Design a protein around this ligand. Sequence first.
Ligand SMILES: NC(=O)C1=CN([C@@H]2O[C@H](COP(=O)(O)OP(=O)(O)OC[C@H]3O[C@@H](n4cnc5c(N)ncnc54)[C@H](OP(=O)(O)O)[C@@H]3O)[C@@H](O)[C@H]2O)C=CC1
Ligand SMILES: NC(=O)C1=CN([C@@H]2O[C@H](COP(=O)(O)OP(=O)(O)OC[C@H]3O[C@@H](n4cnc5c(N)ncnc54)[C@H](OP(=O)(O)O)[C@@H]3O)[C@@H](O)[C@H]2O)C=CC1
Ligand SMILES: COc1ccc([C@H](CCC(=O)N(C)O)P(=O)(O)O)cc1
Ligand SMILES: COc1ccc([C@H](CCC(=O)N(C)O)P(=O)(O)O)cc1
Ligand SMILES: [Ca+2]
Ligand SMILES: [Ca+2]
Ligand SMILES: [Mg+2]
Ligand SMILES: [Mg+2]
Lengths: 410, 410
Amino acid sequence: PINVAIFGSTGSIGTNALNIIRECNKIENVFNVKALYVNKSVNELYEQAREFLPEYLCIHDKSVYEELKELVKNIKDYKPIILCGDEGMKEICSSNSIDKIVIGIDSFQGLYSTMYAIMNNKIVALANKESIVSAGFFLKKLLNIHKNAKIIPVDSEHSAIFQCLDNNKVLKTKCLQDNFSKINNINKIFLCSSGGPFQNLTMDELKNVTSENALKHPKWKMGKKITIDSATMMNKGLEVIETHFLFDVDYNDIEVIVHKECIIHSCVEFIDKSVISQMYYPDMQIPILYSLTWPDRIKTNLKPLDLAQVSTLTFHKPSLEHFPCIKLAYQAGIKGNFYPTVLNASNEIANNLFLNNKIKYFDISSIISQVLESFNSQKVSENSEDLMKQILQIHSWAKDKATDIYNKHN
Amino acid sequence: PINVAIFGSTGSIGTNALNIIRECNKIENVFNVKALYVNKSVNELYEQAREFLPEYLCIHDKSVYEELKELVKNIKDYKPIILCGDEGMKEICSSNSIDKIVIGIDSFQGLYSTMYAIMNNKIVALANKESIVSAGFFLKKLLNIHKNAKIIPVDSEHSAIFQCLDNNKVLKTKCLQDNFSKINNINKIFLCSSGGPFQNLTMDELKNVTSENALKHPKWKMGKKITIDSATMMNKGLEVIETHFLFDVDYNDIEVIVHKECIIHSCVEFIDKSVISQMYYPDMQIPILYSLTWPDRIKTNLKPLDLAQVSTLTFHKPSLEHFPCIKLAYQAGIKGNFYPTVLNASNEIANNLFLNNKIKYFDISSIISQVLESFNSQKVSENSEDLMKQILQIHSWAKDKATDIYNKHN
Ligand SMILES: NC(=O)C1=CN([C@@H]2O[C@H](COP(=O)(O)OP(=O)(O)OC[C@H]3O[C@@H](n4cnc5c(N)ncnc54)[C@H](OP(=O)(O)O)[C@@H]3O)[C@@H](O)[C@H]2O)C=CC1
Ligand SMILES: NC(=O)C1=CN([C@@H]2O[C@H](COP(=O)(O)OP(=O)(O)OC[C@H]3O[C@@H](n4cnc5c(N)ncnc54)[C@H](OP(=O)(O)O)[C@@H]3O)[C@@H](O)[C@H]2O)C=CC1
Ligand SMILES: COc1ccc([C@H](CCC(=O)N(C)O)P(=O)(O)O)cc1
Ligand SMILES: COc1ccc([C@H](CCC(=O)N(C)O)P(=O)(O)O)cc1
Ligand SMILES: [Ca+2]
Ligand SMILES: [Ca+2]
Ligand SMILES: [Mg+2]
Ligand SMILES: [Mg+2]
């Protein structure tokens, strides 16, 4: 039986995780949900607790901590360990009754639990790309210290890549290890993208698009932050860096392709030029499930892919003029050092400004661009604790700098 | 050092096999071409011998044996063992200096060298699907006795499927072995097809198609036999049966899909509903190369796949009214026993009759159908030698029956 904790259980990823676990458990009882962890959504967490009855409940915000304890009392025959904040999360991570942890917490914040899960030698089913982008080489260093810990990618393109590999090669290495692409004979990555809601707009239309435009399309079913990143294609930019760190693929060997039907989720070209790709309907349940079953697969009752019904699949290059965030992400990745950290942080700010109607579409890239050119590279700390502080301080520096730039032009 | 013999070196498969070996050897000196074997193309074999300088040369037609020896003595500093007929084939198969054999011999004839290669515990890179279709159960029996032998598929769709699989599971089993699909978590197979030159014809148009139309469908030249089979989609019917035997997949789990761009070469749906596919330009060099390098990959200088330029991929279900050969294959496969043997034999006759303008398009299926209807199940004999002679009897019977049916009408 697979003992699982869901971190960020009330969001888009967490809900999909619980969905697939539920439906798979109807076929055979494969998963035990041992812990749920949310930020503020106490009512929704209670409802999930009622159904799945985990041994652990944690809410990050102390201000709703009491409210959770009282709500949970209605559930008969159930006495969970109810915890909160950083302290609660660390206790769950160190529990010997948990094997696998799904990280569906958003933003740079997802790094903290990812770090402690690793330090506790757990399998980390990581959907949070911000932690990889911002702390790539820290996570690397951490995985060399904690040799039984593993990151399994949940991000759909990276899951697709991972699913295309031979596991007799994968098991010789692990995600975020130097030389991963060489051991797996990977030559090149086709990184597929929906292209987002603005894919058909002219430069003139792009000037005046609003966050509401970005958020209204039902085709995009995710959290608000990632929805905005999909619209600017900064999401794909982040995923380029994520691909580089997870799989040790050279930036010049990662190609972004717009595939509007979202059936082919990404492709791996091996050294012989043979290309392998993973496909399904655009549904996060597959990537989530695979992270929890790897290196095996289990039966599901998901809708089978009907290729003749889909009938047509299309592919084109993205326009860098229309989506300058892509270009900025390659530039930050190629530059290396802490430039990806700076990229992620300034995007956090720019993303949120646009979401709340404070800046325009092209201001997003303008702000990010100015922060990256403000940054002064630092010698990378050889010490693991000092490296973590370095990342925190640089992330924080970049967010402040982005705010300065916004203010300067406001 | 990969010590390889090429059987049927002067045909389409053989030539392509020598092409990729040549090109790959320029990068890394991997392959030793140890043997070349052809029917009667002595001059072409001579030119190949001068380039590749194999330790063995063999020609099936003894009437050109002296012509071979006389041409070969023109090759400066080179003294091969030049061999003859079935005997020469058996000697090459028993050579310890040979590890892998590519079977690029066409038709039921290919089964003989396939059998002897397996009896000598070789790795058999098998392009010849007719041997599998007509003698699948016998090959399975043979592989159970000769435990170090393996069949690695070369047929592009089956190579595709093989590549889509996770080698960590493939390595725990082998092609034709019981439980292959269970071990590999296979739920179903999308068997892709070019659809052939007649894919867009109406029923009335199809009535009138001739062999010259079928053979003009070019790009890369194949044997006349498979070219006609592609036109009737009997090729795909044979491939459905080949899929069943190679991978132990149920007939109701095999779906034929017409993909006219021939970029996706086939797809595997796993029990979780995730789908994996192999893609490249249509080109037999990759499937050939992979059968010789498996479970590894090596570098090539083949043109990289450019998905943006390809731009569109399309899929549709084939019409069984327009292509009744497909239906006949499912029917023969499902009935089991020696019906696949009978299908293959009667097709060999019908195919050749159509090739030579003796019968019409729909007479092909009519003749095959009548032989299948005529045949009565036989008790399957238990020892290998007995089962082989049983196969040979039934094969000869079915060919004679097809010819008699033809003789009765025209
Ligand atoms: N949504 C998707 O399909 C995909 C998401 N991702 C990645 O997954 C991550 C999550 O995205 P998504 O699910 O869309 O985001 P959501 O906004 O939908 O969900 C965020 C979840 O994290 C929780 N959370 C936030 N902060 C904390 C904290 N400090 N402690 C505990 N829980 C916290 C939230 O809790 P609360 O409900 O209380 O606010 C919520 O449950 C992102 O990093 C994203 O990049 C990647 C690919 C696809
Ligand atoms: N062509 C292709 O791309 C594909 C082919 N296949 C399969 O591969 C096999 C070969 O097809 P293809 O290459 O098109 O066929 P070809 O007709 O082009 O080649 C047949 C080859 O086999 C040789 N041959 C015939 N009889 C004998 C024999 N008695 N002993 C030794 N050699 C013999 C021929 O020699 P000679 O030149 O002297 O006549 C020739 O080299 C077929 O079973 C086909 O179904 C499967 C998928 C794709
Ligand atoms: C509707 O299908 C899809 C919509 C959007 C996406 C991408 C954003 C969400 C994501 O990263 N996933 C699912 O991994 P993007 O390609 O627009 O960046 C992928 C699929
Ligand atoms: C142009 O690419 C292609 C042409 C033809 C085919 C098939 C026939 C030859 C074959 O079996 N191969 C290459 O494996 P079919 O689908 O028409 O039966 C596949 C690909
Ligand atoms: Ca594989
Ligand atoms: Ca009868
Ligand atoms: Mg993604
Ligand atoms: Mg084929």
